[PDB]
Amino acid sequence: SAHLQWMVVRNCSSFLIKRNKQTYSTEPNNLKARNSFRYNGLIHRKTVGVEPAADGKGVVVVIKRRSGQRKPATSYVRTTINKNARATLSSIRHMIRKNKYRPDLRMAAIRRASAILRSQKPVMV
């Protein structure tokens, strides 16, 4: 159960960073990379995560399959997005709002995607 698991990894986890009066958590699919019950990519039955692609073009959107909760090999299905930045956010927004798949990270998911696209274009001097 998500709440029961949260009370265990609340303060004792290998992904927990406590430093400079700030706390961060580094599990793979965690938007905002913060220690919170909402933004934890491990203890929920369904999670949403966006990562940069294998190469520096586009983002990879991964969401958690409903059935294989105890089979991490097939628990996550990943899709890659390599359209325009506006197309990416529109595409991602539909995965969450239209599917009703955790409609609380919708705003968070777009923010992380926009940050990732900024890192893929060249930086001027």
Added chain:
Amino acid sequence: PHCSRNPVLVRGIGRYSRSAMYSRKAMYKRKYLATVTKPVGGDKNGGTRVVKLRKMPRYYPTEDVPRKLLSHGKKPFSQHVRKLRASITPGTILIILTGRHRGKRVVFLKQLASGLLLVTGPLVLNRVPLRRTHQKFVIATSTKIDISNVKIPKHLTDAYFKKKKYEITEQRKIDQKAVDSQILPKIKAIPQLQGYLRSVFALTNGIYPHKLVF
């Protein structure tokens, strides 16, 4: 439309009561596109390209700041009420205190819409052209000249004097000629005003400002 119909005797207080206005206004009888479609220009396309304005942003910043509450006041500077000191009247003689023309004596012209005083000294007297000045940095003398029936050109607004090497444009020179041409004859009307306007104000070993009469 009609006038306010409620003469004001104190700010925020009308003369006539709530029931009095009911009769005066005669209420006893007076009771009761985001998207546009345009063709594409190609066959096997459909000509049904619906385009919407104000499209979604292509980027969202990582954090945003919340909006501030409402204030029901704090109007912008353009609509502030311009307050003029009572001792300032058209034709009075002023003294500049802070600018390049410290101590110069000038005659006060019309006050502008921004609240700045459009003032000039006769350029033939103290080399002071048509300039704006702030009433808070000006001492008002009790010497007055009658600048009634004197035509100040309509195009001397604040935008006219707003800053853009500086060159005196012909429009500034022509406008200066027009104004002082009808101001100087009134200067000559009363004696010794030229020397008064030519000289500069200064404090000496004697007099103190709080004892002087202006």
